[PDB]
């Protein structure tokens, strides 16, 4: 197995606010396949200034997905306290097919703090993070949300310049707060960006960090870092699975403007994925400085015949989901 | 791997004054102004008892006299006014990263006047004389200051081996110490000596304070 | 009231293993944790685990990892722990106290003396010290292990008792106690040491009777 750095040497873990309802917004982003949202490109082969039908795993036209928020955490003037995050952990969703997540959506348009609804600041991009494994069940206390054996776990650090993907087992911590310890609420991340994010110094480890308070990482057989450029612009990531891993989709390398999806990683794991959940993520700034963070929403893959229209640079530019009435059935036929 | 330094190792105070006991932490302990620092009182041959825990909150029960402040890496506790019944060791322990550490301590000792020892010598018993030893033992009791020095003659001649010592802490009462010293010979080299000397030398007195028997004279 | 109750003390081989309990009363355990600690005389107290009773969660310090486990049973309210591989430098007492994470700890067990070696058990032998108060006097020579018990007149002589801490040479230990009395009270009346050695299951009671000459 990989080293992954030492435990965490604290005595307990953040306490953790829930409250849900201050993060059930209706911002709706629907799928339109129409401009190419949420496609990932086709495997094997390139096409070009062509209108093909296809059989693959797309999003339904229309879907609302899932919208998912993180929020600042408590604070008192400049003392952060408890972290705050909606009940993300205890909604274990189905893995099914693989799914496609659109991020960032809402950067620089004006928006709410979440935690302190009538504060408004300029949105800002953040990285999803997402647990996923084979095998799910509760805490000692009852809370859903935890996963058994080996698992994925996809966690942006380093102030969203990179992400780490690691496949270990988890084995909550005892102390208070954590999930096997004393008044477990959630498990979340949290970073400071007071001393985790200045110029030139960006803690690669704090989210990971934070994790470990939570969960003691065992038994890894893989830990990846992918590097990420640092931009407001919106991204499309997915993650399928085959019998020969888990593929990890970015928008961000080919068609970084465009939004296609091409697979950048393939990750060695063979048990098959069938549950996953959303990572709470809360950020530790003081009440003076505290940013809104851009909600990102995921849409279920499913296997469906779409129409797509390849322009002359390759890239798809308008599709459609041929099921999704008798007259798109006609339109695929052209 | 968290270290706590305590200051001082000592310190000896009179009743009713203050009793100031700092612990530094070398890494820091406080997270934006909540440290889970303790402090601990223990008596001989008890358990140790939480006077303070997270920097500044009393134990259920705790007098008042006991005080704890600090933050990031510097604590202290204050004993005020201090009472006879405080003589005992006190412990800073952090609660804040594994492992949980404890600092070495800080003895407290409540001073008071002076007080002479009294000192008892006593033969070896025929229990045990029929037995093939021969133990004498003094017993200096109830003295103030705790340092005393205590030299065995046999003969007029110092004797060092065979030697056991042993001292009780200060008295939680009268603030006194005590001293017990066992001179072990067997019975042969017993029975060839006939003057056996205690001989304790204090504060209290210029010339050694001395006890002695002959062992022909009951 | 609130009660940790532990067991009693053990004299075991170096490699041998034992388990020490504690046995809780009086608060609500399942909600609480429970840490071990160890102390050698003269020394600072050093943390061995904990376990948080809900749960079983155990965080372990590292100097003890694979030589402590500990466990609760949370129908008897009893925390335990197992100590194996044990050598001469595991000898000390040992504490069971509600506290760990971040919660200080609070109660205490009265602490369990464990006692490390290859020596053999050895009683004591108990002589009397006979010579206004009277100063009388009890020694207690050639025994292990530790603890010997040492009363005067069942207890009910407990003031001007010093009873001294035993000292340790060649693996027999030997401790004195002194009683002083008013003169009218000795030898007129009775004065007799009461010596308990639980782990050679020895008591010994001796009257100090006045030398003959
Ligand atoms: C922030 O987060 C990041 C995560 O994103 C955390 O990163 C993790 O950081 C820890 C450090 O704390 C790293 O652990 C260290 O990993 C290195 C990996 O080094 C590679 O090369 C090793 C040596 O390479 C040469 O020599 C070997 C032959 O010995 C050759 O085979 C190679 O080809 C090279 O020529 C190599 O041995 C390592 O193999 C590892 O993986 C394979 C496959 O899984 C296993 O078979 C192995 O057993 C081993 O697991 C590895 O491929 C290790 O080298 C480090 O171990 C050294 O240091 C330890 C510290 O005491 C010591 O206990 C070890 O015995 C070993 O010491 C020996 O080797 C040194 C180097 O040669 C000598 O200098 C030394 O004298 C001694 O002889 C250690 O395990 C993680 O890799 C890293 N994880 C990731 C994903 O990046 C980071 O910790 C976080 N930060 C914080 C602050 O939390
Ligand atoms: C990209 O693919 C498209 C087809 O999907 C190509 O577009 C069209 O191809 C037709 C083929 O018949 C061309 O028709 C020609 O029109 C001229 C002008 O009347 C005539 O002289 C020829 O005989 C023929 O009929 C047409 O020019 C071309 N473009 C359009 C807009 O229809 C296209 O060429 C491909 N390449 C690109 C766009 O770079
Ligand atoms: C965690 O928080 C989420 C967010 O509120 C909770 O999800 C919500 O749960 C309710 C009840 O299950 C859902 O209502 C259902 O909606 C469907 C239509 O979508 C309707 O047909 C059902 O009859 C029912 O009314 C609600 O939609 C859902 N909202 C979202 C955004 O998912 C969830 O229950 C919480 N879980 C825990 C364990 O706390
Ligand atoms: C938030 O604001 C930033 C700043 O304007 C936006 O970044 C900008 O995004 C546009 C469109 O993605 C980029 O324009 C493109 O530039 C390339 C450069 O060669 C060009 O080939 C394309 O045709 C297109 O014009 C622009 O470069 C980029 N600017 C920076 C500084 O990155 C961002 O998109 C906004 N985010 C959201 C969610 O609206
Ligand atoms: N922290 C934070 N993150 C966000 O992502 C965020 C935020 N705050 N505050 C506001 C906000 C707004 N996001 C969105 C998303 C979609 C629509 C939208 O689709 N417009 C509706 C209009 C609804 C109506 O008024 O009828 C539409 O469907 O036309 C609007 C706002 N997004
Ligand atoms: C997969 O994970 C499960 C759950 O953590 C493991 O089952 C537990 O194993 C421990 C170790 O003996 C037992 O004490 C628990 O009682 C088990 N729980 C259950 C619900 O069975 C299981 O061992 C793991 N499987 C593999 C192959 O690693
Ligand atoms: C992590 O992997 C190690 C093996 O590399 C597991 O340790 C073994 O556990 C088995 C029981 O299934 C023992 O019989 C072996 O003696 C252990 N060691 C080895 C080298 O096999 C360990 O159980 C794994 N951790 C978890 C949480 O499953
Ligand atoms: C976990 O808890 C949920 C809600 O309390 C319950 O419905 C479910 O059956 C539990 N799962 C297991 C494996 O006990
Ligand atoms: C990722 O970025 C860090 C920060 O500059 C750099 O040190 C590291 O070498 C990069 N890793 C890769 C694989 O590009």
């Not at chain 1, 982003?29 to 059989?55: F, L």
């Not at chain 2, 006991?66 to 009472?83: A, R």
């Not at chain 3, 107290?45 to 904990?50: C, D, K, R, T």
């Not at chain 3, 009910?156 to 009395?181: I, K, N």
Request: aromatic residues 12%; neutral net charge.
């Amino acid at each position: 197995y990989v080293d992954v750095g030492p435990d965490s040497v604290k005595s307990a873990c953040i306490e953790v606010d829930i409250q849900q309802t201050f993060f059930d917004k209706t911002w709706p982003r629907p799928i339109d396949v129409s401009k190419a949202d949420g496609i990932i490109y086709p495997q094997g082969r390139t096409y070009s200034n062509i209108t093909i039908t296809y059989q693959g795993l797309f999003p339904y036209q229309g879907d609302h997905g899932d919208m998912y928020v993180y929020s600042a955490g408590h604070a008192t003037g400049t003392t952060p306290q408890k972290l705050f995050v909606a009940n993300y952990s205890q909604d274990v969703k189905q893995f099914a097919n693989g799914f496609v997540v659109r991020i960032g959506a809402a950067a620089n348009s004006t928006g709410t703090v979440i935690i302190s609804p009538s504060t408004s600041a300029t949105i800002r991009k953040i990285y999803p993070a997402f647990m996923l494994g084979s095998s799910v069940g509760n805490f000692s206390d009852g809370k859903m949300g935890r996963f058994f054996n080996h698992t994925l776990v996809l966690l942006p650090d380093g102030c969203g310049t990179l992400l780490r993907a690691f496949y270990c087992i988890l084995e909550p911590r005892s102390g208070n707060h954590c999930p096997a310890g004393n008044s477990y609420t959630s498990f979340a991340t949290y970073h400071t960006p007071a001393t985790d994010c200045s110029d030139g110094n960006y803690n690669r480890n704090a989210s990971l960090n934070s994790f470990k308070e939570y969960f003691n990482l065992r038994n890894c057989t893989f830990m990846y870092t992918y590097n990420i450029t640092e931009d407001e612009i919106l991204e499309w990531f997915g993650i399928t699975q085959t019998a020969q891993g888990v593929h990890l989709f970015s928008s961000r390398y080919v068609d970084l403007y465009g939004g296609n999806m091409f697979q950048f990683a393939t990750l060695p794991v063979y048990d098959t994925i069938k549950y996953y959940s959303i990572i709470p993520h809360s950020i530790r700034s003081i009440q003076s400085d505290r940013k809104a963070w851009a909600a990102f929403y995921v849409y279920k893959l499913q296997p469906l015949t779409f129409l797509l229209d390849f322009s002359v640079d390759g890239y798809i530019r308008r599709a459609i989901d041929c099921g999704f009435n008798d007259l798109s059935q006609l339109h695929c036929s052209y | 791997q968290l270290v706590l330094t305590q200051s001082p190792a000592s310190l000896a105070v009179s009743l009713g004054q203050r009793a100031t006991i700092s612990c530094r932490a070398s890494e820091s302990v406080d997270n934006y102004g909540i440290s889970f620092m303790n402090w601990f009182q223990q008596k001989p041959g008890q358990p140790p008892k939480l006077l303070i825990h997270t920097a500044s909150n009393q134990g259920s029960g705790v007098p008042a006299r006991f005080s704890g402040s600090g933050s990031g890496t510097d604590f202290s506790l204050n004993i005020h006014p201090v009472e006879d019944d405080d003589t005992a060791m006190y412990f800073c322990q952090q609660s804040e990263e594994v492992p949980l550490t404890f600092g070495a301590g800080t003895k407290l000792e409540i001073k008071r006047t002076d007080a002479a020892p009294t000192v008892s010598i006593f033969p070896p018993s025929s229990e045990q004389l029929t037995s093939g030893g021969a133990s004498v033992v003094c017993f200096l009791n109830n003295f103030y200051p705790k340092d005393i020095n205590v030299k065995w003659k046999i003969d007029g001649s110092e004797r060092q081996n065979g030697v056991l010592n042993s001292w009780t802490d200060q008295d939680s009462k009268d603030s006194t110490y005590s001293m017990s010293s066992t001179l072990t010979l067997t019975k042969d080299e017993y029975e060839r000596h006939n003057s056996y000397t205690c001989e304790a030398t204090h504060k209290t007195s210029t010339s050694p304070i001395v006890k002695s028997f002959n062992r022909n004279e009951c | 009231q609130v009660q940790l109750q532990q067991s009693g003390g053990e004299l075991v081989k170096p490699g041998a293993s034992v388990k020490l309990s504690c046995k809780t009363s009086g608060f609500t355990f399942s909600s609480s944790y429970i840490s071990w600690l160890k102390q050698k005389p003269g020394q600072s107290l050093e943390w061995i685990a904990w376990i948080y009773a809900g749960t079983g969660g155990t965080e372990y310090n590292q100097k003890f990892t694979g030589k402590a486990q500990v466990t609760v049973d949370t129908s008897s309210s009893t925390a335990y722990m197992q100590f194996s591989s044990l050598t001469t430098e595991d000898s000390a007492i040992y504490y069971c106290a509600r506290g760990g994470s971040s919660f200080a700890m609070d109660y205490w067990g009265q602490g369990t003396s464990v006692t490390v070696s290859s020596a053999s058990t050895t009683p004591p032998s108990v002589y009397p010290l006979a010579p206004s108060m009277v100063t009388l006097g009890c020694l207690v020579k050639g025994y292990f292990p530790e603890p010997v018990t040492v009363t005067w007149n069942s207890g009910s002589l407990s003031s001007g008792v010093h009873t001294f801490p035993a000292v340790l040479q060649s693996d027999l230990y030997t401790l004195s106690s002194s009683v002083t009395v008013p003169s009218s009270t000795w030898p007129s009346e009775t004065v007799t040491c009461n010596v308990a050695h639980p782990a050679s299951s020895t008591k010994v009671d001796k009257k100090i009777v006045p030398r003959d000459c």
